[PDB]
Amino acid sequence: ASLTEIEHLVQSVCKSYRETCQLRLEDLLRQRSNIFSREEVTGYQRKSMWEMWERCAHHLTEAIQYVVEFAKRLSGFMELCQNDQIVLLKAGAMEVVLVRMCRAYNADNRTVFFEGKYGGMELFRALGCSELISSIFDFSHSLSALHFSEDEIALYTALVLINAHRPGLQEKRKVEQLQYNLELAFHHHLCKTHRQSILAKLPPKGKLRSLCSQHVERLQIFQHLHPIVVQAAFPPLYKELFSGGGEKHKILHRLLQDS
Ligand SMILES: O=C(Nc1ccc2c(c1)N(S(=O)(=O)c1cccc(C(F)(F)F)c1)CC2)c1c(F)cccc1Cl
Numbered sequence: 001a002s003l004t005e006i007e008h009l010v011q012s013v014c015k016s017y018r019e020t021c022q023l024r025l026e027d028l029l030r031q032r033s034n035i036f037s038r039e040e041v042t043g044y045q046r047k048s049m050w051e052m053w054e055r056c057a058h059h060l061t062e063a064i065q066y067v068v069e070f071a072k073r074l075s076g077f078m079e080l081c082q083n084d085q086i087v088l089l090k091a092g093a094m095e096v097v098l099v100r101m102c103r104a105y106n107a108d109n110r111t112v113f114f115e116g117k118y119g120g121m122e123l124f125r126a127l128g129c130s131e132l133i134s135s136i137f138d139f140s141h142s143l144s145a146l147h148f149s150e151d152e153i154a155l156y157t158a159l160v161l162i163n164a165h166r167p168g169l170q171e172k173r174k175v176e177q178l179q180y181n182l183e184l185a186f187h188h189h190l191c192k193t194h195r196q197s198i199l200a201k202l203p204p205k206g207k208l209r210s211l212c213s214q215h216v217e218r219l220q221i222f223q224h225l226h227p228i229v230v231q232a233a234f235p236p237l238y239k240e241l242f243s244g245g246g247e248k249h250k251i252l253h254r255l256l257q258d259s
Pocket residue numbers: 053055056057059060063097098101112113114115124127129132133136218
């Protein structure tokens with residue numbers, strides 16, 4: 001691809017990320033002063049474990065839906081075969097959601113934007129997921145040091161999703177060409193912006209994958225112990241991405257058609 005085609009792809013990715021942002025950046029930076037009271041934190045702490053899980057699962061599902069829209073606008077993604085579109089989203093949607101969260105994370109007090117206000121790790125104590133919640137906060141703490149620009153997050157989360165190493169891809173070769181054109185665009189943008197030192201500081205690819213495994217493997221421990229709660233109160237999209245007996249409901253293969 002030519003240099004201007006590469007510049008074209010940078011702008012098309014950045015505009016695609018602008019249009020499918022769940023939260024606006026200027027709103028997140030003005031809410032940093034809006035912090036949960038200690039009594040509000042205590043409210044979240046005394047809530048029942050299964051109620052706190054459903055609450056967070058729905059908020060996670062809503063964020064993943066904006067990632068599907070992001071994929072749907074990605075250059076080349078909708079040109080892939082559907083089975084590869086599902087494989088890429090089944091694996092990378094939570095990863096994109098975990099990277100996008102670092103915008104809603106305040107490194108200057110180790111708080112995160114949750115339900116309109118910012119709060120620390122102790123907000124989620126009722127989940128009984130101390131280690132998983134810590135890994136998420138530390139992951140966001142690392143990305144916040146990079147001081148990503150919105151354009152840089154656009155190209156980074158694009159590559160997080162368009163990955164040719166994903167198990168199950170039927171047309172692995174076409175995803176390779178997609179991944180190459182995007183990393184060339186990402187690298188070209190970092191070169192024009194004088195932000196190439198970011199690449200050496202980026203987290204190793206495994207930490208994102210290990211975070212997902214940490215996340216998913218913890219869910220079905222909850223789904224095994226509290227199975228009826230998951231089938232009745234957890235949202236469908238969440239069960240298809242993350243549950244064993246939840247792939248019967250077809251949800252992704254309709255978000256990818258209704259355009
Ligand atoms: O909550 C979970 N994962 C998740 C991943 C990304 C996002 C959301 C949720 N939400 S959110 O507004 O609720 C929000 C906003 C800041 C921080 C957090 C938290 F990750 F600390 F919970 C959550 C949107 C972005 C979850 C779960 F469903 C089951 C077990 C353990 C966990 Cl962690």
